[PDB]
Amino acid sequence: LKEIEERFEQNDKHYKLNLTQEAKDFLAKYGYSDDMGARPLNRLIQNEILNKLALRILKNEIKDKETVNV
């Protein structure tokens, strides 16, 4: 979690965050693979989150610094 947010709210995204335990659980549960790891989730962390919520936010109607978790 820490890596992306510290890339962006710092400069780019000005971003305040929210976490459902869903993701909190999902990413841990689902996102982490036993064998192949969260290694894909590391990419997925983009996808279902960064890719997802930026896409949520990139409209801006959910404003800057706003957040919507799945």
Ligand X SMILES: Nc1ncnc2c1ncn2[C@@H]1O[C@H](COP(=O)(O)OP(=O)(O)OP(=O)(O)O)[C@@H](O)[C@H]1O
Nearer of residues 10 and 33 to ligand X, judged by Cβ: 33
Nearer of residues 29 and 39 to ligand X, judged by Cβ: 39
Instruction: For residue 60, give the H/E element and its range.
Output: none
Nearer of residues 41 and 57 to ligand X, judged by Cβ: 41
Q: Nearest-CA neighbor of 49 among 12, 24, 35?
A: 24
At 52 the three-state DSSP class reads: helix
28 lies in the binding site for a copy of itself (CB under 8 A): no
Measured in whole angstroms, the distance separating CA 40 from the mean position of its chain's CA atoms is: 14
Site string for ligand X, 4-43 (x = CB under 6 A): ---------------------------------xxx--x-
